[PDB]
Design a protein that fits this description.
Number of domains: 4
GO cellular component, one term: specific granule
Number of helices: 21
Main location: secreted
CATH class of the largest domain: Alpha Beta
Largest sheet: 7 strands, mixed
Helix content: 25-40%
Structural class: alpha+beta
Oligomer: monomer
Distance between the termini: 40 Å
Radius of gyration: 30 Å
EC number: 3.4.21.-
Protein name: Lactotransferrin
CATH architecture of the largest domain: 3-Layer(aba) Sandwich
CATH topology of the largest domain: D-Maltodextrin-Binding Protein, domain 2
CATH superfamily of the largest domain: Periplasmic binding protein-like II
Number of strands: 26
Bound molecules: fe (iii) ion
Shape: globular
Subunit structure: Monomer. Found in a complex with LTF, CLU, EPPIN and SEMG1. Interacts with E.coli outer membrane protein C (OmpC). Found in a complex with MPO and LTF; interacts directly with CP, allows Fe(3+) incorporation into LTF and activation of CP ferroxidase activity.
Amino acid sequence: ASKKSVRWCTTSPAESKKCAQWQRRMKKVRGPSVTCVKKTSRFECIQAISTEKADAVTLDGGLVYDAGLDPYKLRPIAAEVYGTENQPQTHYYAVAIAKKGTNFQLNQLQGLKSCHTGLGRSAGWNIPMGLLRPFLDWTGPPEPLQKAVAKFFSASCVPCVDGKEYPNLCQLCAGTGENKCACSSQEPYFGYSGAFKCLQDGAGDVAFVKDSTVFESLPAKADRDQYELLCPNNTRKPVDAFQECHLARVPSHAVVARSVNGKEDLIWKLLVKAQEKFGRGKPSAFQLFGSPAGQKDLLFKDSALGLLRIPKKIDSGLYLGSNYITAIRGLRETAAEVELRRAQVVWCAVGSDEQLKCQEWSRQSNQSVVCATASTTEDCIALVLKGEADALSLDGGYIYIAGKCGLVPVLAESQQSPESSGLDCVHRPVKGYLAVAVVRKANDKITWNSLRGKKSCHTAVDRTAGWNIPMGPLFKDTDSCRFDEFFSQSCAPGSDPRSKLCALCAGNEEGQLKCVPNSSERLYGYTGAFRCLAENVGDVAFVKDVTVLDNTDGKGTEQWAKDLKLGDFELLCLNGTRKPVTEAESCHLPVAPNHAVVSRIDKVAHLRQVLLRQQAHFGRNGEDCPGKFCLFQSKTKNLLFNDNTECLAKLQGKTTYDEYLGPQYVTAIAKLRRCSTSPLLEACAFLMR
Ligand SMILES: [Fe+3]
Ligand SMILES: [Fe+3]
């Protein structure tokens, strides 16, 4: 029955053939034992693996999706690798090209002529025609997809397709005789390269090929500039903008295994030894990645140059992505179910009252906002990342994990500023706060850059202007992460009580809680960012520009901030120079940015619209705010949105993540985030290879 080995899942006799000997040579060299389980379809193998009848099998992204789905739940453990040694790639973007000139956008495709690579394909048929599902005018399944496509474009050239029922879909192909529209290279507009020649020649207005096609068809760079790419936001972009202007990303075939009790490590150790002893470029005849004579891609791909262990964070949907899973869902869904998902917002929520506030908002909204919930902020972001949720209102550090995973700022949380505004904000800009490093003018050995040695005043350990940014750019150049081996003695409330990081700290009236992250440790907050500096303890202090000119002039608490002018404090200064806190408008660190609402670039416009309206009934000036539910008002905990925000206000040419956060901000946050690692960020970076 079952031993210590790994049971592979063969689907053909020829597939079990290769495995019958894979198992034999594997005992012979001594490397993990492997036995075969032969079924009849990969679908079969899904079920056998899923109930302990087999342990491993490699599948397509269509079947990865389905194997990680409700009943079965297997996961991607290893990617295949394609290309040459110089350039191995794990995946690629399915892309839509068009002549530079034509001012048609993805939305206005209806009624143009298309060139496709081949019916039922990926890149050429399934990816583009499942994404366009909305505009198609298609009932769903038993209806041949192909007559909704027959009606949508005027003429086209979809290779494999029957020019018999539907002749315009074969209409623009270029084969003669009994090869016109053939489903081989005897139809000269077949493939990536023929879908492109279809377009170059003038037969279609768009081609659906992949990232590479133009680069491979037109070397020159001169020629390639007579083309644009249509992005999913409805714009056009040059042909190397495919990374940010693409239709879908297509993963390399994966080996899957069970999530519970999957035997991963075993399967992976078996895979390293046969890759090591029989893989591409090996001495042998038994080659893992290589098949017989009429036998193709048995087991693995004959095209492949190795395997790769995929991060344990990654599951069925992150491996695939949202764009791919969407392309699959719209091909086999009911125009019914399709415009319900197309219209409403699922809100990733975090923890339970954030849970109950959205379901409160849900019923309240008469269901145009719905609720997915993750056990954390990261698992929320991965949910939106795989289409299981559309939104979440995120801080500036997560925004970057967010924008590093393909995601985008929708609406910003415009602060009203705790007390009083007057009366409109949606269109009033965002400001954001000028992060600043202040000094005493009784000090003169001290410039940004003359600082290792000095005393610091931090606001707290791990807050945005008082730690993360001052420590970001300060530590940027070097790649050491010892953020205590730069100042002599810093007071950073959050740090170790004995260290060079809590030595200046105040403590409770010079008494109790010393170097503690609250008001009980006096030299903490803005507050004691300006008070270890202002009482000659700190040489410098990390605050927002306001801690000075909302504390100087004669204003803090009894005794220190009293009789202190503000022209007594001369700002600092990154340039290398130094000026007074007044104009912190040239002499700042970043502007530490507003908490925003991040979604995918598809949801974006719908979402934007639905939150201007949400806010309009329940937002600060809710014509139902006091009256029903209240947008900004948490159950005392900054739930869903932050308590002191005036409104959600549109970004304004502040549309990218790094166009939003600021590039001083990205640096800060990039330095640090290598120092403190994120597995959603590991998982993210891996998925570009
Ligand atoms: Fe393809
Ligand atoms: Fe802060």
